[PDB]
Amino acid sequence: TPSERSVETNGVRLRLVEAGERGDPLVVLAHGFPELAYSWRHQIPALVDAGYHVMAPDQRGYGGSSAPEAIEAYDITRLTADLMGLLDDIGAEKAAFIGHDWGALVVWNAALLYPDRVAAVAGLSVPPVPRSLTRPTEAFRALVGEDNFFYILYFQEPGVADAELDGDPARTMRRMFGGLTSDPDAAHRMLQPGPAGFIDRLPEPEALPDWLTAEELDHYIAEFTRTGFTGGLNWYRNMDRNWELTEHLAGATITAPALFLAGAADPVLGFMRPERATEVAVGPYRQVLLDGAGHWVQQERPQEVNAALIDFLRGLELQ
Numbered sequence: 001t002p003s004e005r006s007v008e009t010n011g012v013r014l015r016l017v018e019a020g021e022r023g024d025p026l027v028v029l030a031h032g033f034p035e036l037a038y039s040w041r042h043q044i045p046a047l048v049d050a051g052y053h054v055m056a057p058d059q060r061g062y063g064g065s066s067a068p069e070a071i072e073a074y075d076i077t078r079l080t081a082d083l084m085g086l087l088d089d090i091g092a093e094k095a096a097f098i099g100h101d102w103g104a105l106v107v108w109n110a111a112l113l114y115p116d117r118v119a120a121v122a123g124l125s126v127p128p129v130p131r132s133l134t135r136p137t138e139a140f141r142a143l144v145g146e147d148n149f150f151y152i153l154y155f156q157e158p159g160v161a162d163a164e165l166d167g168d169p170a171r172t173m174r175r176m177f178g179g180l181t182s183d184p185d186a187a188h189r190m191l192q193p194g195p196a197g198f199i200d201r202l203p204e205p206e207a208l209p210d211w212l213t214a215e216e217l218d219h220y221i222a223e224f225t226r227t228g229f230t231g232g233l234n235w236y237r238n239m240d241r242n243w244e245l246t247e248h249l250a251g252a253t254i255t256a257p258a259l260f261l262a263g264a265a266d267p268v269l270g271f272m273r274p275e276r277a278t279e280v281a282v283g284p285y286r287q288v289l290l291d292g293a294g295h296w297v298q299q300e301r302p303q304e305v306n307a308a309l310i311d312f313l314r315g316l317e318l319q
């Protein structure tokens with residue numbers, strides 16, 4: 001009995017999944033790339049049973065939500081205010097913001113941008129990082145140069161990764177979910193120069209992952225077959241702009257109660273290191289690395305991620 005309703009927020013309309021009773025303390029769930037409010041399916045009833053009001057939107061560019069053709073429509077200020085308008089919708093002064101992946105970044109930036117609204121913040125996979133001195137695309141070409149292959153740089157030029165990922169949504173989703181690995185044979189082959197795509201570079205698993213059924217996987221493929229992948233890709237196309245937009249929080253800090261939580265095997269921690277997370281998250285902080293877990297953490301280790309979320313949330317002032 002999780003419900004869904006259309007919600008008008010921040011000049012757009014999001015498909016909202018929610019469960020529990022309004023008035024109960026509010027916990028917001030912000031998915032990531034290329035994911036949906038469906039990716040919190042195992043979390044939501046837990047959080048409900050734990051006494052919370054849960055909200056899980058398809059974020060702008062995904063699912064049943066608005067998908068502006070404009071790229072600037074996807075910058076960080078847009079995506080955070082999107083979420084705060086959910087609080088507004090029902091009169092909520094503050095809430096707990098939980099995010100996996102791009103969602104995590106969104107919530108981290110939310111803590112800094114709406115400190116008044118954010119009672120607690122949790123980010124999965126992607127850690128608190130201090131604002132770089134150089135714009136990320138500069139940082140990343142510094143890191144990998146201009147001949148090697150690197151996906152986030154591959155996603156910048158509009159159209160190109162879009163065609164690739166749209167071309168075969170099934171291949172995309174199955175290699176995304178089953179093919180993401182920190183294996184060094186793979187890494188080497190992902191990086192190597194040449195014309196091949198990201199999904200091309202990805203391994204294709206023989207059998208389904210143990211944590212993911214056919215039905216579930218089919219759902220993702222369906223929705224992204226309907227929507228395409230441009231909406232989420234346009235989140236990456238805003239990194240430099242989001243860097244400009246946030247100059248004014250270089251000395252700003254998260255004093256809110258924080259939790260960081262990742263599969264120890266998540267590929268993105270190689271260039272999204274969590275060493276300096278306490279430079280940003282200066283209130284209560286906690287790191288949880290899950291041994292042998294990779295990227296799709298809430299889906300892979302659901303009871304574990306439930307228990308950490310629920311225990312993080314027990315005892316906090318969220319209302």
Ligand SMILES: O=C(Nc1ccccc1)Nc1ccccc1
Nearest residue numbers: 033034101102105126152176268
């Ligand atoms: O790119 C990902 N995260 C991210 C978000 C913002 C900035 C940098 C990285 N995750 C990801 C998920 C699936 C495949 C590849 C990457």
